[PDB]
């Protein structure tokens, strides 16, 4: 009922964009 390959995509695509955000953040910061 959930299309199980979508929710594993979701918890992976969640980590990467918050992994990127913090990245650019600290970047410009110590920049």
């Amino acid at each position: 009922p959930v299309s199980i390959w979508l929710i594993v995509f979701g918890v992976v695509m969640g980590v990467i964009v918050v992994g990127i955000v913090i990245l650019i953040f600290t970047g410009i910061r110590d920049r």
Binding site: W5, V8, V12, I16, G19, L23, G27
Partner: protein, 605 residues
């Protein structure tokens, strides 16, 4: 030896090099450890070609012996080249395009040929990682989606092409790719694949954001993990049913295959891809080291681990092929048992494998005209071990079928697809280093706009060109470019690096400068292979290319489900407009090396 003037006051000088590193601590990145540099160089040599390209060529070309060929060619092309590439970046202190423009600035095409080659290899290798993480998302469920056929509309029979083919062969061509019947017929963008592509490029932009001070920890993990998993697959692979029957089949020597012009080409063109030579990334990674770093000991350690790993992955791969071929031989031979039991009324455990042939003739001597309707199979090993699958099918229709017949199916599939992911990732780091650093020495953007902004426009710009391989015919496009591209550019760029250091820079200036870094001017073995052996040995690989290109009858494989005698193979002879694509991807990286050299010599004079 070639008379170029003004070599000094264009490169740094030898007495000035002891002061240049206490000022390039700013405005130039630097490694933290020595192991941070060796782990990002092993990840650039080992990836995705030791899995589905080398163990096929190790066997198909008289395995057990091909080892011999692959070896010699190694300590002859590979060693010398890698060494000369490591020692040229440490000295001239620039990237790839800055080194060849420092020595005779009318040359400059080796930097632009390495950038065009790194753009095209990293464009389609980020679609293979897009396919790999699609199979990783479809794990974490105990009935795997490539384990059984779906029902159609009335729930009475299977889907028609899942029954004639295999269910795994159905998950690739219809539920992953949705492939078409030709390269001419293309459709829509196929959303799921697109989402996956996005994910791949995003995961790549997070790891290579701030140049080299991110791909450090990255390399660490993305370089060890692959090794540990590969190991875990050895003590599981050598235990199942039919390993040591697929290891022996890999190492059977056939000495007739040594006397072939096609053997030594792909054994030669694998060495330039077992390493990462003529790509322009190993010069930019070596240019961050200290000036007195030993680059002679690094090129031997890197090449020993690369020659040991390629044998080590072939042991792991052919243990799984040996398990799948023993299983298919037993689920074939048990159906030849089941036919006569259903026709001659014999007990259950009656007529096993030890007594097949004698119980064939006991029945036909008992009563004739009842054996004539019996359909038996002629299945035998060395016919189940001998399929010629290569390039993507060794992971998506061969390796993942043997995983479903193991004990814990959704755990050996998560461990298998995170490993491939890691390999892909390290190779990606390499190619990205290859396209960003020559795009800074060209100065396409102002000296504002920091390192986050240039990498973000490469990861977004190569994403939109990657829409070609998400179409319905997107797998015929990816099988086209690969080979060609790689091969040609690699060989050509690799020859002019060995030429323009020995005969344009000067191998006598080179020796002195090397000695200044390490001491002990290199041996007679280094002087022989640099001067005479490896430039000569790289010409007969270039001569064998135009021998095997003019007679192989260039074709490609399609799927075509609505076709008479369907699940065998197909070759249908590429259209005439595809030579435009072959000339573009293989010719213009090869022709910018003379093309800029003709332009610069007629702009001055």
């Amino acid at each position: 030896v070639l008379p170029n003037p003004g070599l000094d006051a264009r490169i740094p000088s030898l007495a000035e090099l002891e002061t240049i590193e206490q000022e390039e601590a700013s405005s130039r990145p630097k490694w933290d450890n020595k192991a941070q540099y060796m782990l990002t160089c092993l990840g650039f040599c080992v990836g995705l070609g030791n899995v589905w390209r080398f163990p096929y060529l190790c066997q198909s070309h008289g395995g057990g012996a091909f080892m011999i060929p692959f070896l010699i060619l190694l300590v002859l092309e590979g060693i010398p080249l890698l060494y000369l590439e490591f020692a040229i970046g440490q000295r001239l202190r620039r990237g790839s395009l800055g080194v060849w423009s420092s020595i005779h600035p009318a040359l400059k095409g080796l930097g632009l040929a390495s950038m065009l080659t790194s753009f095209m290899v990293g464009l389609y290798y980020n679609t293979i990682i897009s396919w790999i993480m699609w199979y990783l998302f479809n794990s974490f469920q105990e009935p795997l989606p490539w384990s059984d056929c779906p029902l159609n509309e009335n729930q009475t029979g299977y889907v028609d092409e899942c029954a004639r083919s295999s269910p795994v062969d159905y998950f690739w061509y219809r539920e992953t790719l949705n492939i078409s019947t030709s390269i001419s017929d293309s459709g829509s963008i196929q959303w799921w694949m697109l989402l996956c592509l996005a994910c791949a490029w995003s995961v790549l932009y997070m790891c290579t954001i701030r140049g080299i001070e991110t791909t450090g920890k990255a390399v660490y993990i993305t370089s060890t993990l692959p090794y540990v998993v590969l190991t875990i697959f050895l003590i599981r692979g050598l235990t199942l049913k039919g390993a040591t029957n697929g290891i022996v089949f890999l190492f059977t020597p056939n000495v007739t295959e040594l006397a072939q012009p096609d053997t030594w080409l792909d054994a030669g063109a694998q060495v330039f891809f077992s390493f990462s030579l003529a790509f322009g990334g190993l010069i930019s990674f070596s240019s961050y080291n200290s000036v007195h770093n030993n680059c002679e000991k690094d090129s031997v350690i890197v090449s020993i681990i690369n020659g040991f790993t390629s044998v080590y992955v072939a042991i792991v791969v052919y243990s799984v092929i040996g398990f799948r071929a023993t299983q298919r031989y037993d689920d074939c031979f048990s159906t030849n048992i089941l036919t006569l039991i259903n026709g001659f009324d014999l007990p259950e455990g009656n007529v096993t494998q030890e007594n097949f042939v004698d119980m064939q003739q006991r029945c036909n001597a008992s009563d004739p005209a009842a054996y004539a309707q019996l359909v038996f199979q002629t299945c035998d090993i060395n016919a189940f071990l001998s399929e010629a699958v290569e390039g993507t099918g060794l992971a998506f229709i061969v390796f993942t079928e043997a995983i479903t017949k193991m004990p814990l199916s959704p755990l050996w599939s998560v461990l298998f697809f995170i490993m491939l992911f890691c390999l892909g990732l390290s190779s990606m780091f390499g190619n990205m280093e290859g396209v960003v650093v020559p795009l800074q020495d060209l100065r396409v953007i102002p000296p504002k706009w920091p390192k986050e902004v240039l990498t973000g426009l490469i990861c977004l710009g190569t994403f939109l060109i990657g829409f070609i391989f998400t179409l319905n015919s997107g797998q015929y496009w990816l099988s086209l470019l690969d080979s060609y591209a790689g091969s040609i550019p690699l060989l050509i760029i690799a020859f002019c690096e060995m030429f323009s250091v020995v005969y344009v820079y000067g191998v006598d200036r080179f020796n002195k400068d090397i000695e200044f870094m390490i001491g002990h001017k290199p041996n007679i073995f280094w002087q022989v292979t640099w001067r005479v052996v490896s430039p000569l040995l790289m010409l007969i690989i270039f001569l064998f290319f135009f021998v095997v290109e003019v007679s192989q009858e260039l074709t490609y494989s399609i799927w075509d489900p609505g076709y008479e005698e369907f699940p065998k193979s197909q070759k249908i002879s590429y259209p005439n407009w595809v030579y435009v694509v072959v000339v573009i991807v293989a010719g213009v990286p090869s022709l910018t090396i003379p093309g800029y050299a003709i332009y610069k010599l007629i702009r001055n004079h």
